[PDB]
Design a protein around this ligand. Sequence first.
Ligand SMILES: [Cl-]
Ligand SMILES: [Cl-]
Ligand SMILES: [Cl-]
Ligand SMILES: [K+]
Ligand SMILES: [Mg+2]
Ligand SMILES: [Mg+2]
Ligand SMILES: [Mg+2]
Ligand SMILES: [Mg+2]
Ligand SMILES: [Mg+2]
Ligand SMILES: [Mg+2]
Ligand SMILES: [Mg+2]
Ligand SMILES: [Mg+2]
Ligand SMILES: [Mg+2]
Ligand SMILES: [Mg+2]
Ligand SMILES: [Mg+2]
Ligand SMILES: [Mg+2]
Ligand SMILES: [Mg+2]
Ligand SMILES: [Mg+2]
Ligand SMILES: [Mg+2]
Ligand SMILES: [Mg+2]
Ligand SMILES: [Mg+2]
Ligand SMILES: [Mg+2]
Ligand SMILES: [Mg+2]
Ligand SMILES: [Mg+2]
Ligand SMILES: [Mg+2]
Ligand SMILES: [Mg+2]
Ligand SMILES: [Mg+2]
Ligand SMILES: [Mg+2]
Ligand SMILES: [Mg+2]
Ligand SMILES: [Mg+2]
Ligand SMILES: [Mg+2]
Ligand SMILES: [Mg+2]
Ligand SMILES: [Mg+2]
Ligand SMILES: [Mg+2]
Ligand SMILES: [Mg+2]
Ligand SMILES: [Mg+2]
Ligand SMILES: [Mg+2]
Ligand SMILES: [Mg+2]
Ligand SMILES: [Mg+2]
Ligand SMILES: [Mg+2]
Ligand SMILES: [Mg+2]
Ligand SMILES: [Mg+2]
Ligand SMILES: [Mg+2]
Ligand SMILES: [Mg+2]
Ligand SMILES: [Mg+2]
Ligand SMILES: [Mg+2]
Ligand SMILES: [Mg+2]
Ligand SMILES: [Mg+2]
Ligand SMILES: [Mg+2]
Ligand SMILES: [Mg+2]
Ligand SMILES: [Mg+2]
Ligand code: NA
Ligand code: NA
Ligand code: NA
Ligand code: NA
Ligand code: NA
Ligand code: NA
Ligand code: NA
Ligand code: NA
Ligand code: NA
Ligand code: NA
Ligand code: NA
Ligand code: NA
Ligand code: NA
Ligand code: NA
Ligand code: NA
Ligand code: NA
Ligand code: NA
Ligand code: NA
Ligand code: NA
Ligand code: NA
Ligand code: NA
Ligand code: NA
Lengths: 73, 237, 56
Amino acid sequence: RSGRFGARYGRVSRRRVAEIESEMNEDHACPNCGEDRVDRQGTGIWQCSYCDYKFTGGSYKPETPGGKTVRRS
Amino acid sequence: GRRIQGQRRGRGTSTFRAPSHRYKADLEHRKVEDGDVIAGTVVDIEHDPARSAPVAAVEFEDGDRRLILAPEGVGVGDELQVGVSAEIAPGNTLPLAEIPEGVPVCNVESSPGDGGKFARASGVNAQLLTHDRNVAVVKLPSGEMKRLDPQCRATIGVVAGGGRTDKPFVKAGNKHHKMKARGTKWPNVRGVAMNAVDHPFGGGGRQHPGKPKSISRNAPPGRKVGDIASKRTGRGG
Amino acid sequence: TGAGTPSQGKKNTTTHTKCRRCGEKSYHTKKKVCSSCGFGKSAKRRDYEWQSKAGE
RNA sequence: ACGACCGUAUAGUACGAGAGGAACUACGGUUGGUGGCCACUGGUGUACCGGUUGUUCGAGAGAGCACGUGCCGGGUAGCCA
RNA sequence: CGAGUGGCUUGCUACCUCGAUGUCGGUUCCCUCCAUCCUGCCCGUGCAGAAGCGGGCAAGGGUGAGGUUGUUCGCCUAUUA
RNA sequence: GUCGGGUGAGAACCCCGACGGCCUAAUGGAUAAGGGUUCCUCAGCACUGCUGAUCAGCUGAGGGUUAGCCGGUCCUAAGUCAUACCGCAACUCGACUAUGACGAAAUGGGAAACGGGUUAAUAUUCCCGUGCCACUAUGCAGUGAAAGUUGACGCCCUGGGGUCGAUCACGCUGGGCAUCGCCCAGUCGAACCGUCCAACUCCGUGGAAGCCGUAAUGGCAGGAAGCGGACGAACGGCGGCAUAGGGAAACGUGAUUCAACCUGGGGCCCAUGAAAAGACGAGCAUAGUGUCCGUACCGAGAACCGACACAGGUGUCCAUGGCGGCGAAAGCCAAGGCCUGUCGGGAGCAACCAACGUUAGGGAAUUCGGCAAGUUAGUCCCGUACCUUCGGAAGAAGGGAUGCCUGCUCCGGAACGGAGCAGGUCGCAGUGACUCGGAAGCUCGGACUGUCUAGUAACAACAUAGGUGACCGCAAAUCCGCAAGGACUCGUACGGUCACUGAAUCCUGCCCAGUGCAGGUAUCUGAACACCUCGUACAAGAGGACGAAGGACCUGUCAACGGCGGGGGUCUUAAGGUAGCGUAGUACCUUGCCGCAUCAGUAGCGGCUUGCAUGAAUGGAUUAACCAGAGCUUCACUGUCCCAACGUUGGGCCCGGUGAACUGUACAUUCCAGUGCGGAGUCUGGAGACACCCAGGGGGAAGCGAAGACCCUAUGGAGCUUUACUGCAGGCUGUCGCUGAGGACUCUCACUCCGGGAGGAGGACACCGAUAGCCGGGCA
RNA sequence: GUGGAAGUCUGUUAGAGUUGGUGUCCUACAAUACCCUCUCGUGAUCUAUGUGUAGGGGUGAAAGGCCCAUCGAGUCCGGCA
Ligand SMILES: [Cl-]
Ligand SMILES: [Cl-]
Ligand SMILES: [Cl-]
Ligand SMILES: [K+]
Ligand SMILES: [Mg+2]
Ligand SMILES: [Mg+2]
Ligand SMILES: [Mg+2]
Ligand SMILES: [Mg+2]
Ligand SMILES: [Mg+2]
Ligand SMILES: [Mg+2]
Ligand SMILES: [Mg+2]
Ligand SMILES: [Mg+2]
Ligand SMILES: [Mg+2]
Ligand SMILES: [Mg+2]
Ligand SMILES: [Mg+2]
Ligand SMILES: [Mg+2]
Ligand SMILES: [Mg+2]
Ligand SMILES: [Mg+2]
Ligand SMILES: [Mg+2]
Ligand SMILES: [Mg+2]
Ligand SMILES: [Mg+2]
Ligand SMILES: [Mg+2]
Ligand SMILES: [Mg+2]
Ligand SMILES: [Mg+2]
Ligand SMILES: [Mg+2]
Ligand SMILES: [Mg+2]
Ligand SMILES: [Mg+2]
Ligand SMILES: [Mg+2]
Ligand SMILES: [Mg+2]
Ligand SMILES: [Mg+2]
Ligand SMILES: [Mg+2]
Ligand SMILES: [Mg+2]
Ligand SMILES: [Mg+2]
Ligand SMILES: [Mg+2]
Ligand SMILES: [Mg+2]
Ligand SMILES: [Mg+2]
Ligand SMILES: [Mg+2]
Ligand SMILES: [Mg+2]
Ligand SMILES: [Mg+2]
Ligand SMILES: [Mg+2]
Ligand SMILES: [Mg+2]
Ligand SMILES: [Mg+2]
Ligand SMILES: [Mg+2]
Ligand SMILES: [Mg+2]
Ligand SMILES: [Mg+2]
Ligand SMILES: [Mg+2]
Ligand SMILES: [Mg+2]
Ligand SMILES: [Mg+2]
Ligand SMILES: [Mg+2]
Ligand SMILES: [Mg+2]
Ligand SMILES: [Mg+2]
Ligand code: NA
Ligand code: NA
Ligand code: NA
Ligand code: NA
Ligand code: NA
Ligand code: NA
Ligand code: NA
Ligand code: NA
Ligand code: NA
Ligand code: NA
Ligand code: NA
Ligand code: NA
Ligand code: NA
Ligand code: NA
Ligand code: NA
Ligand code: NA
Ligand code: NA
Ligand code: NA
Ligand code: NA
Ligand code: NA
Ligand code: NA
Ligand code: NA
């Protein structure tokens, strides 16, 4: 997490940076396979190390609240 | 006095220009004769240096290879279609007429065939609301009701890269690197921190603006600074 | 660093050179223009009235 | 080119109800200033002798360098306080 | 209340210098004045003594160390003839 | 540097030998720019050289630079130019769009060379040997031939392959040393051609339900291990090259760690890390061709820039030479270079000065202030407070250990790697030199890293993330241009513009009267054209009607500018200071009062606090971490001080040589007093005074240096400001023209934009040209 | 235990910067130098070369800083006696 920031920046900065990266790094259940293998390749880019699926998603999460709403309607 | 920073900008000198030569593609909708037979396969997902968000590499049946404004939920192998009779799913582009209401849409055109203008940045999306033979009301991300020609093409889905603004830059270095990829002079010196000669707010023995910050719309360049034609200011009230 | 002697040492750049047209060492090799005769900027030879006293 | 102080004897005396408490003189020392001198104490002493670290001359012996002595210990004369 | 002396303070003046007489405080080093703080010699005393107090002659010598403060000034401590 | 010697009319510094030193990322080696012949040889000393010179970068004369395979040349980069178009009064001016060209010599991409020899001076260029590339021609093969690959790419961590170098063992050749048996050098050999292949990828087989694998992540019934196979690397191994070359000779062999070079795995991005030419794809023989330009030397404490042979400035590669040690550190020493950071001789060499060593007792008493100096130090073991945003604080603090010798143990494949053990043992001292933190506490400020006044300010100032407000739907907001046009923008509100505040945490009160901005508006005010009236055979002109933006008037708004008192138990002018903080970097009074601390404390800290004249994004309070920031305290330390001494090196003094400058109305041996435009070596009165010279520290010449920065004056200047005067851009608005058909409306045909186009949107508006009113320190 | 993040720490690695000494110099070695001390040193880093922005205009993490020893409006010549 944000622990690499040393004793700098303050609570909120290391708080949000940690949490965001916590959820960002989580074992994500892949789209092209229900296997927990999705890794952030860059800003908004994701990939299932399993089936090699490279896809678009939120900047930090593979799926965004607004993204899930798309499939619905 | 000397010309203020906003005036230097206009000159379009190196410091103020965007690193165009490093930019990848001018993401624009395709030009199909008609029919709608045009389709293609997502070959890759790239980072767009101009928008800090993903752009999808696509290869069309007619050999054409072009990058595109990728909405969320698009990956390699997927088949995207463009045309009047295109399917109604994410990544596909068709006029607002052929688009069912209540469905989030991005990269909307202003004038049919202009390649798309509205809602193209990270996470945003418009909202097709009302249909007609003449008009197609679309709610832009700013919350404005934009009356549009039903012929205006658009893409289904929310622009990819959503939530970018959630995490703070934390340190100047991170801002530095971002700013370095845009047409913007950074860092920013406060007017009130300059000399009278340099900015209308400059001067004094302490830092504060001379006159009130709200400036008339009619103000000339060199003077139009601070709160431009503010209808109000502050939070209270 | 001083703008004087210490700033003089970096001066190993060639700019003004012998002019193919006027023979003067004023052909700026980076601008490709002669500061003396205007060669590279003008078909006409560089000349101004202020090069001499107004009534002469 | 000498200025000033403290102390002892005078004296628990003169004076004084008492408490308290002088002086002339004679001595001893202190401080400040002054001039000189180095037996004594002290400093210096890259004169000198010893110990020792690194490195170089193969080892040994014996040496060079380490800022104008590598460092450490001792220190004659002289100059000094 | 009245008469003065000084030229340290302050004020006044605008004589001297604006082709520049380097600031305040401090320091260091030298000479001087006396309206004398100490020391020498004296007079008075509401001078018993001791300790003082006031005054006279007198400028040989002395008049030191520190805490706050840039301070001069001043406040404070302990020594001191 | 010294002693000898050489040359020469002449030698401290020109040459030779010896002894002695200096330089180690440089004072060595290779180069870029820049210089431009400085390079080599001969002959010289009038010039230049911090003294001299027989020497020289100087003077004169000669000579010297050789390329198919090193560079240029070619390609394209940020970007530049030329032509066309368009603008402009106009151009040597100017933006866009086309086209073409230009744009990289160390250091982007890129067809191809190595070894030896040779000159006074060149050298992958010449010579000898061997090799390679491209093109063309002939001959044979081939019909393939363009899909694809390559050129071609960020930052961080990391494994494997592996050459040189270094080191180790051993052998051989040569050298050195002389109580020993050690120590040093060498032990060679290319490009190229052929061959080998780890890694990655894939295929077959196989068949794991828990195994496989890694430094680490990881892998798998969608098929794990194992086995076989396809593809496939080095500037690497191996063979040739080579009874080539080189060496006086031997002309080794193994190993370890491994720069170069090769090949993999992992991680990061609100950051995404060139292009084009070319090459590959796509064989072989023989032959021919391979022009043009650069090539000397310096590359720096004398060849460059800085007026100089200037202590300054100036890019790249050699980062693997030995000991040492964590090390590209110190210190010492090779190789290579040098004694040219170029004046010498003499005095125990005084005073005084610059650098510096050591000083007893005391120990900050010094001083604005510990300024300066000193103390501490490396490594391991033990141990470690308040506080804190939980990261940190922290090497907190404090305590102990540390060498050598002998013999060993553990880790590891091993190191000439690391961690330990037992015994013996020397010194005052074992990180023995070198290298190498002084520690603790309170307060102020800014959160942090960062920025800044090139040349007196590095800070609390700027920036920053973070917070906040404002404008804008893109034919936009903002901005540049006279125009043609342009930046933002290969951008689209999670945007980007314009501003304020300045991390996190707790918070951010009341005020819209004035000013600003914005919205509305019955009525009032409000220009010009057109229209009506009068006037004039026309016209000037006078009046009227209609009335835009703007204003009056009304509302909104303070994280807009700003404000938050007097009086009495309301009044000015809207409100009347809330949380907090407070004698403040804000408090005049003031050294406020009380306390802590000291012998003594205008200081510092704490409390109080009526605050001359604190206070909430003109941000208020608080706060860990950070700091060449301001103040204060303690321990430690010490020549800062008491109070100075001695010593060391370079000067200083004397001698040879070289050789300036500042300054100068005149006179001038002055001292005490006086006088004078009131601050005299020169006037007046006295006193003193023989002349010249050496050294000194600077009392005076109101010393030298600068036509005073301070102050005033001038109908002087400039930068800046504004509700100063007057104007000028610009924005908004009406009217006219472009402009057309049928106080409200339709249309299409000009005009504008979108779309490749068909065609769509818009449309007499907009744009553009003209004029009028308003705003208008943006500018003059 | 592994891992090896960081506008992270120590650091005269290279390199960059410039705090104090108010030292040395101050007709200098130098029209901004020397020495010691001190700061940064994986990043908003440093740097070479090429290239763009031009004078009421640039450029400016803002000091009225910088734009060739020239800056509250560069330099040259002209207006100009
Ligand atoms: Cl941003
Ligand atoms: Cl070359
Ligand atoms: Cl690996
Ligand atoms: K004066
Ligand atoms: Mg676009
Ligand atoms: Mg933000
Ligand atoms: Mg930029
Ligand atoms: Mg700012
Ligand atoms: Mg300022
Ligand atoms: Mg202004
Ligand atoms: Mg402020
Ligand atoms: Mg302010
Ligand atoms: Mg300058
Ligand atoms: Mg020695
Ligand atoms: Mg004087
Ligand atoms: Mg008297
Ligand atoms: Mg006297
Ligand atoms: Mg010649
Ligand atoms: Mg020569
Ligand atoms: Mg000769
Ligand atoms: Mg070219
Ligand atoms: Mg190249
Ligand atoms: Mg040569
Ligand atoms: Mg050469
Ligand atoms: Mg020299
Ligand atoms: Mg002592
Ligand atoms: Mg004191
Ligand atoms: Mg004192
Ligand atoms: Mg100090
Ligand atoms: Mg073992
Ligand atoms: Mg030591
Ligand atoms: Mg204070
Ligand atoms: Mg700071
Ligand atoms: Mg400065
Ligand atoms: Mg600083
Ligand atoms: Mg400074
Ligand atoms: Mg600030
Ligand atoms: Mg902000
Ligand atoms: Mg913001
Ligand atoms: Mg107080
Ligand atoms: Mg407020
Ligand atoms: Mg006389
Ligand atoms: Mg004057
Ligand atoms: Mg003035
Ligand atoms: Mg003026
Ligand atoms: Mg257009
Ligand atoms: Mg003005
Ligand atoms: Mg750091
Ligand atoms: Mg450091
Ligand atoms: Mg440059
Ligand atoms: Mg200023
Ligand atoms: Na101001
Ligand atoms: Na008087
Ligand atoms: Na007076
Ligand atoms: Na004068
Ligand atoms: Na004084
Ligand atoms: Na006296
Ligand atoms: Na005092
Ligand atoms: Na090979
Ligand atoms: Na080593
Ligand atoms: Na010489
Ligand atoms: Na830093
Ligand atoms: Na108001
Ligand atoms: Na108002
Ligand atoms: Na206030
Ligand atoms: Na800093
Ligand atoms: Na000393
Ligand atoms: Na004098
Ligand atoms: Na001015
Ligand atoms: Na862990
Ligand atoms: Na310095
Ligand atoms: Na100008
Ligand atoms: Na003139």
